[PDB]
Symmetry: D3
Subunit: 307 residues, 6 copies
């Protein structure tokens, strides 16, 4: 409804240039706000952040096409900024969770068929559900695995984005990283669906930096909940749980993610009303998530299935 | 005096059910406020926190008995909430350090003879002195060792809780973990009483996650000062010292604590007036200490002398 | 101009006692404010901080001489407090970057010829330029190497303190530690001047605590930018970059710095208007940098070329 | 014929008792000499070696049943000594390859149907083909994985035991350990049959005492060629290849073998005429190999699919 | 009698000078052949081996005093060669067990009272019993710990040297290193006398180059059985057990031995008739053992209770 | 004379083709027997050993050219077998030291000018002096570093090959690996010529599989004395020193050798009369050494200055 301006802009996105096949990318970036306050400054804060990555590459942000492939010598990575989905000036009505879903499912379908890798910033994680279904519908043959970073397994509620994808059998497998609050009900669902998981204490006690190897052949959807970070690095989350990952811990682990291609990326769990602020009113979580998004984009451009 | 309501409630606590012998536990929880502001929100914040532990077990909080042993298949851990010692509505008079001592010594004696493991939350660390003496008086034959987590050795002042226990010879040994501010006077007392210590830089440079082994046969009292954490994780401490433990560091190390039983647990050094707050007025230290308390309780239920 | 009171005080500093030759030290401490707000509380906050180091030694702060060598049994380390360079009560005029330079170059020249090791606290890093030139002019034969801790290489701008020293060929070599934002232009300058660097992800993935060895024979200038720390530990920096060093990480690495003597120390990049504050108005970065300064001083007293 | 005395003794073996209900074991031990000199003293030398193992347990060797399942915690491991297959006394004729096969096939078949874990000692590796086919014929349902210790992949030759098992499609998977002489034809067969391998240099550089905890749920056959050991430890092999495992290395690696049960064990590649001998005529390889056989027997009694460790899942 | 020539030479040894004031050493070296063949060439072969050690120091062998305490930093280690105990020339009679004991007891007694650290070479291990009792008789005040390198616990037999020392209550503690053949009766004695042990498989899995820094304050006797080494390195032992230490492994582990001083050293378990020989008749075990004896002597000159490292305390 | 047949065959070698444009190789292999018994079978035994290497590549031995540069990805490594230097058939006179030198000097000179990497097998180490001087005479511009594997520094004697090269100032640097017998005169020469060294105990304690990634840009000569290996792996050396590298250890360490190219390789210190033999008269050292020669040849074909890893610089 007030996604309409955002939706029509994605509809007219110039399709993948014919030199982007046999090539990872390009990356399509947009803002997602489901379950979060209307004022969502994370996407804009990212666009303001420096574009030099941890690895020796640089993001190139374009508000509109044409998005064309550069030489692999200069190593630039084009990002098409599709902006916020919610037109914050088109009204005061709050979109229902079903409206967020439909709008997200439509934007993902469009960006994927156009040949872009969709990267959603913000929201409560419901975006994961919509753009995984969008890929599965467009490519029913492909097997999808989800690498999910969170403090919680988030598969307790049958209406959870991860739980819905599992019950509908759209996922080949699930990799849960950094859980540190696991209920018995979570364990039952983990057993039933046979999920692979590495809880926080397990990662720590077995060399946190000693994570590099093991081969994965299936296209990967990367779902990142901000709560996977320790509250000292990411306070702006609902019901924080201490003893989590550092920002550098998270970057290292996600750098070791293997696969033939990235299905999509979801960064979420961020609430500006819960953040810790510097005296100049900049939030800690925004700073942390800004670099996570960047290295997520780089991963979408450089992911390999085995080394 | 205004501990009277709290004290009479402990007096009527139903003694250990006859299926709790040959069994670790149960755990008795109460609030302690000596040397700290009257508004002590840490205990209440803990009771509000999620009860799923790092390990696959769950705390079960009861305000009153009966506290009975469940099957070891369901793995529940009963915690008897005895509430705050200081009746914050009974007056405006501040209890002296001697009154805090007497009240704490009486509550500990009662909870121990009832068959409970006492866990004290809050205060300045003086609670350590009182419930160690309460155990020693009730069990003069048993040898007690203290595992003490702090940024400082805290044995300089002859009136320090740790120093008093040492001079009175109630301790078999002392394990100081994570010191990073050691005076020459501290070193003299460490030499005289032959304390085992692993300073912060020593822990770090010799594999922080490489701490697991070595056998201990003596019942352990766990004394945890919040200052042992780095100020980035626990700012709410008097005279903070940078370069400390992360929350995950602390959880890992305390998980490796060995012994036949836990004498008692002291979590302290927390001042709400010194904390760093999120925009929704929740303090970082409260979040950190909330999980430390939980895994301390779990340790009291699962501690083993050697593996 | 309003450095005049500070400058005349350094002019009358009692020269190195004749028992300080064949001996590392003493250390001269002063405040530097170039490129930063006039209210610079870092130096005063350090002087207020505890003086017990990580290692079993203690700083002894003297506002005036005589600064004489104590026995190596008591292990005291004299620090001559020269106070803030900018007389915050002498006027409202802001010194130009050229005035900061001249004033700093003059104070360094004086403190060095007096036999002191200069330690500058605060500013934007321009102090590095002035006291390295002061040493080179006084000792043209000696070869100088810089160990530089920063999130950025800071050699992009031809007017950067590090870049100027390089182009003028006053440095034997450059060790950049903890970069995590490297532009292509940075890489070109790193290649041209043949700088040794260990970027953040490289340090982390190859055992962060596994850094100890390798021999260095050249006198070392230690330049520390606060941005090298993760924003969770040091938020008070311009344009923060997540995924940085912890305070303990930094202390460990700098402890492994080898050399025959310390040329000088620069701690900078701190802006009180950008810090995260506790409820009692103490900044996190100030706490972190306070201990970095202390162990920097200790390094100036105990540095060795190889073990 | 040559195997007559041995076979009829194997027939009369009283099947394992009901006391072994859902229990690993027991183990049946016999000599196998295909492709090797007539004097095959490795079996005799093992039966003379100490019974105490690395881990705290004791071998108990028996020539005849009943094989009593010991009290739950005494840590005894009964072994049924079935003796030598070839009876050198009766006859002077060397069995053909196919005769060795049929002999090993029937012996393995009988012991398996009686509920024994067969452990073959000696030979050139042809035993691996026989007893794996004996198990697969008796239990077509079970999926078998082979852990193969050797200096060579031993699948280049179309007539090789392992290559035959793979071409017949009788194996779920193959784990080759300690190869250090791999031909191009080997590598062509490796990808063709998708077999897992950890070459010798790869084991060494990635911490020899750091071999993973991958969970295996398929019954394991353990095929051990002596050539996997360095010639300094096991010189009694044809065409020795330097740069191999130490006996300690091998014991550690085989101790990490995972599975619900062992389908069978084959220890081979030993030739007395190629050994290095002490002044009292005891060979070094035989010393090393008797230790290998013993810990192989212990593995058959205590193998497990994985070590359950809370907080982390296990890759299959 | 048989020990007559050796004993009277030991008697005439000029006691260590005053220059050794509060100093480790010196070391007295002698041959000991109890339980072993008459030709015992290990001592002669050691005296022929190079003097330069692993760590930068040089052995200086002497047959007669005075043994001058070298300048503080020249890194010379004087060794007093006391020769063979049994004189094969004088007489053809084999000494009984008790005669070996009394001979070793008196020799050890004399060298200790003269201020020498006794290093015995050869025999079956009976020397450990003698010189430990010689030290304990001379210094009842001192508490002794024994570090025992062997493939076997060697305390099952009530008549075993180590078992006798434990039953007589002459030891503060015992550290058994490298066991890989442990019987149930052994384990019963181990808990009964509360002896510390690190079996071979435990040493290997937990990083062989990762043995701890536990502080020891008691004087150490070092009892070294050659069987602790793998048969590939030391085949000249009775009943060899595969899967042992390399010579390098052993040198590293014994280099980590802590203590105020060494009470004595015994290197045994070597039999020339069981060795593996090169074409020029040099045995492998003798090569390995001479290196072991040398680094044992160096240990006696430079042993320390602990390495003081700031920030962390040391477990006793 | 003695080298007549060998030399004139070396002269007629057709120089490497233009297909080797900016390419490592090819390798020329020849026997060298200075200081050793007349029967020198190490070369023959290597030419009989399997061609397949540790890493996936295959040796292809040739007696005569043309040596065709193989397709870019077939992983063949052509080796030119130049045979034995000394022709035992023609004449019964032992060459003097200087005659060995001149023979090796001219052979090395010819092969280098033809664009071959010379690999010498056998001798006492004198070959190192010859071919390094042959390279330095042909390429005075290039700075050479020597990687020297030995149990001894081998620079005490003023007449030692390495000491001569250092005194003549023909080397940029020297990396001594695996020393375990270092005299005081050695240490005096070490600081005097500022040579880098990693002694055996230092390699072991600091993780044997943990040797660094230091970048080297100078052409490397690889001088390999068999004594660097433990006597259990290589007993056929003069005055054996226990506590050395395993064959595996050595292969790993030499695989980490960095450089733009190999100037030459010398494998020596082997004496058939000092070896330990199997019952079929095959020596253990020869087995180990043929593996060493093979991986040395592979190193000459695939050596690199450093592994470029993003984010961290390399110490030169």
């Amino acid at each position: 409804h007030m996604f309409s301006k955002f939706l029509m802009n994605v509809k007219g996105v110039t399709p993948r240039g014919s030199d982007w096949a046999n090539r990872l990318g390009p990356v399509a970036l947009f803002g997602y706000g489901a379950g979060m306050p209307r004022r969502a400054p994370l996407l804009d804060f990212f666009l303001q952040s420096p574009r030099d990555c941890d690895h020796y590459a640089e993001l190139t942000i374009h508000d509109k096409g044409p998005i064309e492939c550069p030489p692999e010598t200069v190593m630039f990575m084009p990002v098409l900024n599709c902006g916020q989905m919610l037109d914050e000036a088109a009204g005061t009505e709050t979109p229902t969770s079903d409206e967020w879903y439909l709008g997200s499912l439509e934007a993902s379908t469009e960006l994927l068929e156009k040949g872009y890798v969709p990267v959603s910033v913000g929201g409560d994680g419901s975006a994961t559900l919509s753009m995984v279904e969008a890929y599965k519908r467009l490519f029913p043959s492909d097997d999808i695995v989800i690498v999910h970073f969170s403090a919680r397994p988030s598969v307790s509620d049958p209406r959870s984005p991860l739980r819905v994808l599992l019950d509908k059998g759209l996922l080949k497998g699930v990799v849960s990283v950094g859980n540190r609050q696991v209920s018995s009900e979570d364990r039952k669902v983990r057993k039933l669906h046979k999920m692979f998981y590495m809880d926080m204490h397990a990662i720590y006690s077995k060399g946190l930096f000693c994570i590099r190897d093991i081969r994965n052949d299936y296209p990967v959807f990367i779902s990142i909940d901000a709560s996977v970070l320790d509250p000292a690095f990411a306070p702006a989350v609902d019901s924080p749980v201490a003893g989590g990952l550092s920002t550098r811990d998270l970057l290292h682990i996600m750098n070791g993610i293997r696969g033939p291609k990235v299905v999509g990326i979801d960064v979420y769990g961020y609430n500006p009303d819960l953040d810790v602020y510097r005296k100049d009113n900049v939030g800690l979580t925004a700073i942390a998530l800004s670099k996570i998004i960047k290295e997520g984009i780089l991963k979408a451009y450089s992911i390999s299935t085995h080394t």
